[PDB]
């Protein structure tokens, strides 16, 4: 699943609901982030899910769903959730965590961990991320191993960049955070700037004399 | 293509700063390596990323980790744009080899094409990929950011330190971990074997499930 591919629909069991979870129904007209984790009841996973449970409103208000995913059962997810709530000082769990016990979805998405296996000796997923647009396109991906917890701040920062550059002709520079100046895309002609920007462009002159180094403060 | 734990393939290519062929396995022998691509020379986000990694090059070399750049531009393009990068970063030299994939063979093989970005000729360009590669040529982590979205350079280093730490020690790093912070004991390490590996004591946190997996250790 290269960048720009269409993230496939699937139906699965999930935490906190009794019926079928269908992805496309859940994420219609929304950004989505689908994130996996190796095993329920393990420490790194608990810290990550507790953090994303805290940040869940920050995402929802940007019109972005969070969807969890592991190769554990529903009964595992539901019991483990009370651990995540306790660790994280949370009082309301809202992120659906998909179940993939058969590993069909994990094999199709190509997110298996290099190392981790459950108690039954069957393989488990790594820490994947898929950032998905309202049109079901994979805008960005990450595959972290079971050994290395994610940066939850980075997850919200990429999302903000993706949503900004979705509607405006800019790209966000190294280490950009919301509120910082961004870059004008290099193909945007100077005759074309005022149609798109209220504020002034800053030009930084380069030894090559090419005029591509332009910042804008939105 | 190249999932976690797969072997990163050898290649040989032209590169910035040298006039001979660059062979990947040669350059990274007995070394951690981070291979990072950018879409196009002479464009603004790319210049800021490369300046930053150039400033950070000593941080990486101290950890025994090679940085290797990559775009679908020629050598002549790379060499000239290097002077732009050096100017923007206030650098006096440049030592990261930037490989050339003008034919797009390597980028089609690595599956690092950007969804939208094209050059002046109409041909497609790479996204902003990262491959973290161990001394045995195994892919430990990857990231694919699009052209629209510059990477977090602090995060690249945080991940490398994490991958190096957990490579040799029975720990895993929790969410948002930085070097110096307590990390987690792997859930399968049993009690009898805890003091072979750890000088400092372990902290256990009680869970409603009464399971015993929530263990922190300060190294």
Descriptive report:
The structure is a homodimer. The first copy, chain A, has 218 residues and is an alpha+beta fold. Chain A folds into two domains: 1-150, Glutaredoxin, CATH 3.40.30; 151-218, Antioxidant, Horf6, Chain A, domain2 (Antioxidant, Horf6, Chain A, domain 2, 2-Layer Sandwich). The first copy, chain A, has helices at residues 23-27, 43-54, 56-60, 74-88, 104-109, 152-167, and strands at residues 11-12, 21-22, 31-35, 64-70, 97-99, 112-117, 123-125, 127-132, 138-144, 170-171, 182-184, 201-203, 214-216. In chain A, the strands form four sheets. The first copy, chain A, has a five-stranded mixed sheet with strand order 5-4-3-8-9. In chain A, strands 10-11-13-12 form a four-stranded antiparallel sheet, covered by helices on one side. A two-stranded antiparallel sheet of chain A has the order 1-2. The radius of gyration of chain A is 20 Å and the shape is elongated. At the A-B interface, helix 2, helix 4, strand 6, strand 9 and helix 6 of A face helix 2, helix 4, strand 6, strand 9 and helix 6 of B.
